[PDB]
Amino acid sequence: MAGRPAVSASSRWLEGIRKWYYNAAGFNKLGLMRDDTIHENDDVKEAIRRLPENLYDDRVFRIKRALDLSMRQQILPKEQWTKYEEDKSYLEPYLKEVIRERKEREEWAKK
Amino acid sequence: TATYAQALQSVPETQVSQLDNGLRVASEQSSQPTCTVGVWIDAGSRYESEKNNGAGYFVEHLAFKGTKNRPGNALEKEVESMGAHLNAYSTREHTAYYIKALSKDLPKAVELLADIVQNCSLEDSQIEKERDVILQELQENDTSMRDVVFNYLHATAFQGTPLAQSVEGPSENVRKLSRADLTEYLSRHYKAPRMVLAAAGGLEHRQLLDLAQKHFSGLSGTYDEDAVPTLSPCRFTGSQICHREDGLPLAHVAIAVEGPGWAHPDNVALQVANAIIGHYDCTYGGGAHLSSPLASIAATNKLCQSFQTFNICYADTGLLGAHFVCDHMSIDDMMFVLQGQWMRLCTSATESEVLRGKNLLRNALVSHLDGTTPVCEDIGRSLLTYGRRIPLAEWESRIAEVDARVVREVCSKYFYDQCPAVAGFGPIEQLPDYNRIRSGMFWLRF
């Protein structure tokens, strides 16, 4: 149950479309996870500040080496890419709480 | 089964009775085994000219040092061995002497209170030794940043008027005060018509009235052609005093405008406005989550060490404003948001925050009377300012009639486009110029 609202996508089945898009996006070739490429607004920036030191420091190096790869216009070897199944959201739990906090704060103002 | 409104109705009603010479005997019956009784008199700095300024502080000091009946420390020894607490405070409009003891101890407490009032001794050695005492904490009071600033604010807000004098008075006036001035001050301001003897606790009103009839009957009123002197209005004066002293670490600044007065009904709406702005000083667990926008910003970026909103009420004037304590590089950053909050209520106040202010005012009145000691002060002081004493239920009726429209109208009448009085102390270099302060009273600048 993935891909498109239809039960079957254009290029057969539904789950493989997201897998196909992950390789098409190409941020795994740089050694970055999905949440390492997110837009840093006033919400995401706070949710980064709550990251544990072991996870925040890991994110820094993944970004640091990706810019080195982008500077040289290169990519990581085929064995060092971020697998689609092994990519996990290390920032979604923190984003959701800031979503919850901001929604309560915003709605409390209008009362 | 007992709602908030019903509980206010069940509060015992104050009983006020008048004596033959004009003494107002007031009490509130209760069930406590303890009680306090005190006498509130119309006296203070505002009633003293420049020549006898600070007599009340001098008089209050000698009040407990000896009477005609109990010379020396016998008056003090009677209270201490009895187990009672004796206290006395004096401000620019009132002075008081209240004693807290057991309910069964009421008959002796009233007898002592009459002796302090009618039979002050003022021994020649007592004045000389108390003169050096009064000259002592005057040096001490120089170190109180908050009290000095409010004295500065009073000096310039009501400059050239009796209300600008200090309760303690100038040091030179203290040195030159003699016994003749003190006894003249007593015989002019300590009269029955301008007096009220209040009490609260486990005491019957009949007992207090009879006790007052036994001891306070000797008090006299309408002494001479002066009889009961009348006050004169004091004119507020928009000004600014800046004692810049860089040695002191923090800056205390108080800015206020003329208030309505004691009897003006606009005090309720103004007290709701102050509750909305609130208070905060560097020790609240709320931090950035505090409901008051001024407190939330002041805590988010650490603007002030302290700040509070006050409404000082007098017979026909007042000092409605705020006082804040901050760094030497935060005066402009908070005076800008302090006045910005004032202009918000005058222009755009929402009903939700007025409801927060109304609830805050509701708790202030109910929780202030946490015993017999604050009740008698409320009973005694009201009978000198409001005339009658306002029941708590009546206060709720006036509070429930305040809304956003009232707050917007009331605030815009005393705050918007009015000349404020500014008092500073410490490192006030950053403190903005008065024209910058004055122009902050209005928005849109056009």
Binding site: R49, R50, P52, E101, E104, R105, W108 | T1, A2, T3, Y4, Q6, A7, L8, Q9, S10, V11, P12, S30, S31, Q32, P33, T34, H61, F64, N73, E76, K77, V79, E80, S81, G83, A84, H85, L86, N87, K100, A101, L102, V133, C282, T283, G285, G286, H289, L290, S291, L355, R356, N359, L360, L361, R362, N363, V366, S367, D370, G371, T372, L392
Partner: protein, 439 residues
């Protein structure tokens, strides 16, 4: 208005129901929790949760956890967030304060009786189910330095901290504030351990002011599991006796010379309390000369300079500290301590008069009645009683106990202080302040 000193009220013409007083309801739950609900029909309602989670219950490893736990209020919980708690409390005008002594930790909420149910949820969630998120605890950490700085600004608040440190090697010696090295070293794991161990039915009691018993009954006993076996406290303490002297160049010298006294509830503690007023432990007349104060009068002769002295009676559940606290100039610090100490020795030698005892009994009775006279003070009195003991004692019974103190017991209490092992804590300019061996 009604139950603001005795928990039994005099008849006041039953009519209307709010204008009528009633008795007091005291119950103990099967799990050990204690509920003491009151209905004084006052406009304001006050609820307090009293816990045996004082600063003494911290061991050496987790010092300062109680201080951070005291500041830990108004933080995100499992039912209400930090924003919701701060906004929800202030919207109804209520207040939320945490009182913590060395033994107890009281969670008090004050509001109007119309919205006491809202204050119930914000109290249990804060007290029982805190999330203790790592970022929030880290952000609240620098407040420890700010709170300790202002609280230690008063010079006599620091001598008391050293007084217990010098007198004990154990629980009671822990200061009420996080140590200078622990600011930043506290972790959410320690806070969860402290909460889990020290928040239990057997060490908690719920006290209300203007609330029905079933309302309090239904909101008490949910998830209390284990006692405070983490360390130090929960397994008794012991008294040491020492001397701590700190110099800071201050103009005024604060000295506290105490000894070992008896614990609360014990009949010997009452002997010290009435002895505390024989020596004089606070002025009664503003700007008075303290004629009846034996300590102040004793030092009045000889010392003709500003000074201050009063008795000190710190009593606890397991032990106590009794002695005198003095303030004097460094030029004559030793004279004031020695003169005040010699006066106590005269009391121990039987040089006491019955009228002196009678006045002290009157001061003790009056001082106690006004202490519980206030609504806030009344809650603290019963709240600690429901923790130290298992039931409430009416003030009339307390007055009888004070009146049942023989004059011989006062002399014996004085002998215990004089002959005991002293514990001296001093501060200021200690050039002339004597040591323990110099009396």
């Amino acid at each position: 208005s009604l139950k603001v000193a005795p928990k039994v009220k005099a008849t006041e013409a039953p009519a209307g129901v709010p204008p009528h007083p009633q008795d007091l309801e005291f119950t103990r739950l099967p799990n050990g929790l204690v509920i003491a609900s009151l209905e004084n029909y006052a406009p304001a309602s006050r609820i307090g949760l009293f816990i045996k989670a004082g600063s003494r219950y911290e061991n050496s490893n987790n010092l300062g956890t109680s201080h951070l736990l005291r500041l830990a209020s108004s933080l995100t919980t499992k039912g209400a967030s930090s924003f919701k708690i701060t906004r929800g409390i202030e919207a109804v005008g209520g207040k939320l304060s945490v009182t913590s002594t060395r033994e107890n930790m009281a969670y008090t909420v004050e509001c109007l009786r119309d919205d006491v149910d809202i204050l119930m949820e914000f109290l249990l969630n804060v007290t029982t189910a805190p999330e203790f998120r790592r970022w929030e605890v880290a952000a609240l950490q620098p407040q420890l330095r700010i709170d300790k700085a202002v609280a230690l600004q008063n010079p006599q608040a620091h001598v008391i901290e050293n007084l217990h440190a010098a007198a004990y090697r154990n629980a009671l010696a822990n200061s009420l504030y996080c140590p200078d090295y622990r600011i930043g070293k506290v972790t959410p794991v320690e806070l969860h351990d402290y909460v889990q161990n020290h928040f239990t039915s057997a060490r908690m009691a719920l006290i209300g002011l203007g609330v029905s018993h079933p309302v309090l009954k239904q909101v008490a006993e949910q998830f209390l599991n284990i006692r405070g076996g983490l360390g130090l406290s929960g397994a008794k303490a012991k008294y040491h006796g020492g001397e701590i002297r700190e110099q800071n160049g201050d103009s005024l010298v604060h000295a506290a010379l105490v000894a070992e006294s008896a614990a609360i509830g014990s009949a010997e503690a009452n002997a010290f309390s009435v002895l505390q007023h024989v020596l004089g432990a606070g002025p009664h007349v503003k700007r008075g000369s303290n004629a009846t104060s034996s300590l102040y009068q004793a030092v009045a002769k000889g010392v003709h300079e500003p000074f201050d002295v009063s008795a000190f009676n710190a009593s606890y559940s397991d032990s106590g500290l009794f002695g005198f606290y003095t303030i004097s100039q460094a030029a004559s610090a030793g004279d004031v301590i020695k003169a005040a100490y010699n006066q106590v020795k005269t009391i121990a030698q039987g040089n006491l008069s019955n009228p002196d005892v009678q006045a002290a009994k009157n001061k003790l009775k009056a001082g106690y009645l006004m202490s519980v006279e206030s609504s806030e003070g009344f809650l603290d009195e019963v709240g600690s009683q429901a923790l130290a003991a298992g039931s409430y004692t009416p003030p009339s019974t307390v007055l009888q106990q004070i009146d049942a103190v023989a004059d011989a017991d006062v002399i014996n209490a004085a002998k215990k202080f004089v002959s005991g092992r002293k514990s001296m804590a001093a501060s200021g300019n200690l050039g002339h302040t004597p040591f323990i061996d110099e009396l």
